[PDB]
Design a protein around this ligand. Structure first.
Ligand SMILES: Nc1ncnc2c1ncn2[C@@H]1O[C@H](COP(=O)(O)OP(=O)(O)O)[C@@H](O)[C@H]1O
Ligand SMILES: Nc1ncnc2c1ncn2[C@@H]1O[C@H](COP(=O)(O)OP(=O)(O)O)[C@@H](O)[C@H]1O
Ligand SMILES: [Ca+2]
Ligand SMILES: [Ca+2]
Ligand SMILES: [Ca+2]
Ligand SMILES: [Mg+2]
Ligand SMILES: [Mg+2]
Lengths: 74, 126, 371, 160, 57, 371, 57
């Protein structure tokens, strides 16, 4: 079931990228600690997102360059 | 300009291009840091009691899940681009490789190496 | 390290390191024991002279080729030939060099398996690979399509290839080759009075064939001309004097290629087995095969064969297709040049049959994925 | 090799006199004065080895501006630097690709004439308009005026 | 000379291909013209018949 | 942004940006894996050549269409075809372009739902819409009424429309089309000696059908004439020479359209299913449908069909009605031109199936209001 | 090879001349077809008017 694999893959994308959040047991002080950790995680995630966007842009640019080289050779 | 002179001309062209590439990368990193700082805004830590911190942590978890899914999407895009560029470079090799076999000769020794092997320790320049 | 591109062949062993233009050492593959008694003491007389040494002492030897028709009939002699090739003509121990043998199409399996077993047990090479003798000749031409007619000295085979995809159902292997032409020439020379019988004199007849014979553009006209004038009679000096004059034996010896009925063979000539090999291919790649017909092998070096073959195929083929016959000047070593090119490739570097693989599956590994 | 060709083009006393001394020693059979094919082959053979003549002929006729079987000055240094491969084809394919993709300012995989000349002005090296037209023709394998990466690497061969 | 021959062959092939395409186009359009001419003749006859019908009615 | 007007079809995929006159890239929809072994190393041999690339290497491939009769039988191959169409023939990423597929009438639901699911999950388009292949062909003619006979290569369907109100109870879908005519021509060519069997030679028979066959105005008279004179025998040169001569096979191949009993089908020809489709309509719109009969699709390009069909319908229809057959010269791309016109409309801009709507209702959204 | 190259180039020239002539023919026939299409449209209008008058009578 390749389609089953794709559907379970997208379900795992929606589920595993979700983490088990535990902040109600972390007391007000530990709640502040958890808020700081969550902010650090989300800021790092956004940095990774932007880096991936830029690398995708550059890879697309190199794809265009190589394809144009092919067209000139063909 | 002579042959060596025009070689140095194209070398300085490559040098100016390297300067441009380095400044492009530096400004890219600086402006992406600026954009992330506009996005990644630190929040105030003190003054909030338990419930507000819990709500903020729930919101942070939701944002983490969302941005993680988005990062997965962009990583898939990057993997697709890697596959496509690999195929294109392989087609480049197919178009102008394979049949580009050079004449591998084991009897054309290096001029210095050939002169040494035929004279001892005579050759030292090249 | 560098790879050893050996090429057993049948009649001339051609070897050399991968990446060069020409084989380093080319010498006949004959092993001849002495046959007389020998009276001088301490002369240092050996028991078997192999390679090019036995082409100089052939007056008192009984030369016998260890390879009859592609297949190997005398394994001890072949082992001796390989040992000589490695140690005296190249002077490189085989313990530190991969080898790339070559084999005719449609040969018995046992021959190939024994070859790999010898190379791995006796000489103890790091890794060896066996390749079909026609694909290499197609490499050397720098093409990627085309139907190659590799008329060696043992066996003539005709492998069509398109876009790199070989067509296994269209290989036409015929066992007429240079050796049968030598025997037929030796048999028709008797019509003038010259009798060559000894296995040493077969070499003299081979030299006559190489230096004098040529392929006639039109057979009947040449037969009529040689029977009236005398402009064809070329003379040749034997190894002792007594020059001989070859008349219409000049173009009758290599004519056997296009009419194998001369030596009693039933099959059709090399001009018609190529057309049959083409017609077995699919209907859409016949134009490309027509335009890229490749010649290789030693026996295709006769002066005037690239025109006779083109005329014959143009007669057989449809009138619209263009018939072109690629006949590079480096025909004799085409297979070995292609072998060098193939061994020098980076993509090919992981296809060798590594020794640990042979230890795990036995000699029958050659028929497996590592072809 | 990249330094060897340039240095030997305007060489000082040392290695030019080495070449002259080699020529004077070669009088043990070769006396043509200007190195021809057969004298060169004889000199190479009398050294003690028999290399494949194809390398010698490509040294003596391919790179030459005459290719008549004789030996010129600059092409002798070309032969000397062609024994090995030290001139790295004008940098590496990764660096060349980066400089070309930043050079491709309109991002179309080709180098137009206008941005090419603007970047050439940015180079600031010694300017020879004749050499500029030479590079323009070197970038015309497909005769479009534009330089793609193929011809870019082609005329960058040996740029050190 | 071999390279020159290859170039001549490819030019001839391209010219023949264009010639074949033009032949096909001319065939199609000429067939259209023939059909339309037949239709026009029939239409003139029908027009005369219709005028006669108008008069009699 | 601009919309992508793709049109899967069956036999030729036609695509291009909305608002132009002709599709940008038209190429056969075939995916052919190589079938032989392949001996050249490093030749860069791919595992599947799709589109127009596999019509040049068809000599060593096994071409197989992924769409049998309108319906799609091999979803992986269809996905490959779509990926090729988007990325290599148009070079526009689908993440930034709406798409407008086309589908035959009366097709299985699962086909349409899978199509929309693929377009939304794999290619991840912003919004896609599926339209019936006959309404577009009616758009292209600039009409608003009329009964359109869209005889494609997969399936022939006949949708009557009046004043913009389609009549769902009068659609007559018949599964005889160009492919069955190709098979029947390939089957009747065997009566002269020419045997085409391979799936690659089906393309050659298709070319013969396109270039030579024509529809006879009167069948019996043509059968009698071709059996006495020889003014019909037109010759054709195969891809390798050996010209062939087609006699009365010329007008017997496309005659199957008007007599489906030739290939064993029970139903009536395309000349009588149109009249039946008209007679199912109401009694007051039959004159308009008679006067605005529209032809479309590739297979209606046979020379002389617009007269045979008119003669047949005039024979069937009442004598008073005027029968007119609209046969625009741009018949082949009529569906795609209509698709471009429909996608370029402002009133249509809110009918697309937006992605958020699909996320809320699943793939079954296509059967809902957004048809 | 030289003789073959010369013959190929001559063939290419002949094919180019044929292509030019075919272009001329195609354009001429296209113009004629357009003229006859206009004529047929006039025929159609005449028939429409005659039919209407017949109905009235
Ligand atoms: N110049 C030549 N002219 C005619 N025949 C030749 C010539 N050179 C070699 N031959 C024939 O070809 C044979 C050598 O063929 P070769 O290609 O060495 O066979 P293999 O495929 O076994 O290497 C010799 O036996 C000789 O009969
Ligand atoms: N000029 C022509 N003459 C006769 N038949 C044609 C012609 N062009 C195409 N055909 C037939 O029509 C088919 C193409 O039909 P097409 O309209 O592309 O189908 P689809 O509706 O799937 O796009 C081809 O398979 C061919 O058999
Ligand atoms: Ca010179
Ligand atoms: Ca540019
Ligand atoms: Ca250029
Ligand atoms: Mg051989
Ligand atoms: Mg259609």
């Amino acid at each position: 079931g390749k389609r089953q694999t794709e559907r379970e893959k997208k379900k795992k994308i929606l589920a595993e990228r979700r983490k088990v959040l535990a902040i109600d047991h972390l007391n007000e002080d530990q709640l502040r600690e958890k808020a700081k950790e969550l902010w650090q995680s989300i800021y790092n995630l956004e940095a990774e997102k932007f880096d991936l966007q830029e690398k995708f842009k550059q890879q697309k640019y190199e794809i265009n360059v190589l394809r144009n080289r092919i067209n000139d050779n063909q | 300009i002579s042959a060596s002179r025009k070689l140095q001309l194209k070398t300085l062209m490559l040098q100016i291009a390297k300067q441009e590439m380095e400044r492009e990368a530096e400004e890219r990193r600086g402006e992406k840091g600026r954009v992330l700082r506009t996005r990644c805004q630190p929040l105030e830590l003190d003054g909030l009691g338990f419930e507000e911190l819990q709500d903020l942590c729930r919101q942070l978890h939701a944002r983490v899940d969302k941005v993680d899914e988005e990062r997965y999407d962009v990583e898939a895009k990057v993997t697709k681009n890697i596959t496509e560029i690999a195929d294109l470079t392989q087609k480049i090799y197919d178009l102008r490789g394979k049949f580009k076999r050079p004449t591998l000769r084991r009897v054309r020794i290096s001029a210095d190496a050939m002169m040494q092997a035929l004279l001892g320790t005579r050759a030292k320049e090249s | 390290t560098t790879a050893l591109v050996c090429d057993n062949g049948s009649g001339l062993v051609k070897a050399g390191f991968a990446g060069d233009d020409a084989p380093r050492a080319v010498f006949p593959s004959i092993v001849g024991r002495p046959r007389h008694q020998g009276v001088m003491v301490g002369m240092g007389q050996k028991d078997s002279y192999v390679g090019d040494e036995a082409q100089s002492k052939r007056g008192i030897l009984t030369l016998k080729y260890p390879i009859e028709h592609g297949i190997i009939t005398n394994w001890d002699d072949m082992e001796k030939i390989w040992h000589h090739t490695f140690y005296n003509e190249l002077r490189v121990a085989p313990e530190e060099h991969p080898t790339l043998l070559t084999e005719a199409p449609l040969n018995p399996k046992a021959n190939r398996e024994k070859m790999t077993q010898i190379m791995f047990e006796t000489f103890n090479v790091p890794a060896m690979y066996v390749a079909i003798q026609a694909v290499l000749s197609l490499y050397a031409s720098g093409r990627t399509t085309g139907i190659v007619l590799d008329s060696g000295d043992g066996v003539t085979h005709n492998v069509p290839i398109y876009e790199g995809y070989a067509l296994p159902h269209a290989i036409m292997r015929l066992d007429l080759a240079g050796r049968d032409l030598t025997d037929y020439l030796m048999k028709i020379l008797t019509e003038r009075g010259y009798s060559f019988v000894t296995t040493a004199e077969r070499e003299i007849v081979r030299d006559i064939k190489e230096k004098l014979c040529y392929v006639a553009l039109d057979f009947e006209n040449e037969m009529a001309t040689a029977a009236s004038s005398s402009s064809l009679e070329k003379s040749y000096e034997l190894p002792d004097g007594q020059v001989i004059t070859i008349g219409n034996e000049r173009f009758r010896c290599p004519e056997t290629l296009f009419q194998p009925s001369f030596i009693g063979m039933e099959s059709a000539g090399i001009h018609e087995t190529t057309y049959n090999s083409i017609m077995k291919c699919d209907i859409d790649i016949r134009k490309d095969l027509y335009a890229n017909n490749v010649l290789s092998g030693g026996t295709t070096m006769y002066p005037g064969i690239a025109d006779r073959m083109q005329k014959e195929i143009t007669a057989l083929a449809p009138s619209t297709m263009k018939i072109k016959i690629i006949a590079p000047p480096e025909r004799k070593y085409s297979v070995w040049i292609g072998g060098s090119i193939l061994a020098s490739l980076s993509t090919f570097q992981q296809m060798w049959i590594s020794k640990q693989e042979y230890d795990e599956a036995g000699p029958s590994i050659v028929h497996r994925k590592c072809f | 090799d990249d330094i060897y060709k340039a240095a030997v083009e305007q060489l000082t006393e040392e290695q030019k006199n080495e070449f002259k001394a080699a020529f004077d020693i070669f009088v043990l059979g070769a006396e043509d004065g200007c190195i021809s094919t057969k004298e060169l082959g004889k000199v190479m053979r009398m050294l003690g080895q028999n290399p494949t003549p194809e390398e010698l002929q490509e040294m003596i006729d391919e790179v030459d501006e005459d290719g008549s079987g004789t030996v010129d000055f600059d092409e002798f240094l070309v032969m000397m630097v062609r024994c090995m491969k030290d001139d790295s084809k004008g940098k590496s394919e990764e660096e060349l690709s980066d400089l070309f993709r930043m050079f491709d300012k309109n991002a179309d995989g080709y180098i137009d004439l206008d941005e090419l000349k603007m970047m050439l002005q940015a180079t600031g090296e010694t300017i020879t308009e004749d050499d500029i037209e030479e590079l323009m023709k070197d970038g015309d394998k497909n005769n479009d005026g534009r330089i793609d990466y193929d011809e870019f690497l082609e005329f960058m061969k040996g740029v050190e | 000379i071999e390279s020159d021959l290859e170039r001549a062959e490819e030019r001839a092939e391209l010219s023949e291909g264009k010639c074949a395409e033009l032949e096909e186009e001319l065939k199609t359009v000429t067939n259209n013209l023939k059909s339309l001419e037949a239709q026009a003749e029939k239409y003139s006859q029908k027009e005369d018949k219709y005028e006669e019908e108008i008069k009699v009615l």
